[PDB]
């Protein structure tokens, strides 16, 4: 099926616990992959504009790692219902990608979640000033704007522009292309 292949090709990339010991400034991501229509998507947030670090922003769910959190994954799954509504019962955590070194003392880990069909999401106003998705396939040929390089993606239902960057557009290339490279039509 469409989501046992996904989570197969996901698998091969999971670095599971390899990095997660190492002494950082310790965050987490939920990449969050929607089925609708047949085909995958992953869903963003647009960050409040109250927030002190980086407001209007795309970025995944997720945030620092705090003394209640079990592993990094708790991390996510913690940030993700805080922002979204998302409950644990409906994500399953298939993978953790590549952690992503920033500023030199911060590590920040990526999970691919597979969420449930029946997740509606809640946002959050204090956290999230909007959440939407994306089709997984739009990053294998995306609208590229230069200012580095910038993804503007147009959702066809109401006409809206989201601009993507920095390492939230490098991730969501990257679960792209482990998901929906070497496919037959
Ligand atoms: C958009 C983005 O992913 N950001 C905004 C602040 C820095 C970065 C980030 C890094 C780790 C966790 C985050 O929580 C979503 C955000």
Do not use: W
């Not at 980086?54 to 922002?83: I, N, S, Y």
């Not at 069909?117 to 396939?137: I, M, Y």
């Amino acid at each position: 099926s469409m989501l046992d292949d996904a989570k197969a090709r996901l698998r091969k990339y999971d670095i599971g616990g390899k990095y997660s010991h190492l002494p950082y400034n310790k965050y987490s991501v939920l990449l969050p992959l929607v089925a609708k229509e047949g085909k995958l998507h992953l869903l963003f947030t647009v960050r409040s504009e109250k927030l002190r670090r980086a407001p209007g922003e795309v970025c995944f769910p997720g945030g620092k790692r705090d003394p209640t959190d079990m592993d990094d994954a708790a991390t996510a799954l913690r940030e993700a219902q805080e922002e979204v509504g998302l409950r644990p019962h409906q994500v399953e955590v298939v993978c953790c990608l590549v952690p992503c070194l920033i500023d030199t003392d911060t590590l920040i880990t990526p999970f691919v979640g597979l969420i449930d069909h029946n997740f509606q999401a809640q946002p959050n106003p204090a956290e999230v000033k909007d959440v939407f998705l994306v089709p997984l396939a739009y990053f294998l040929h995306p609208q590229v704007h230069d200012q580095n390089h910038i993804f503007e993606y147009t959702n066809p239902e109401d006409g809206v522009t989201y601009q993507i960057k920095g390492m939230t557009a490098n991730l969501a290339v990257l679960v792209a292309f482990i998901i929906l490279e070497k496919k037959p039509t």
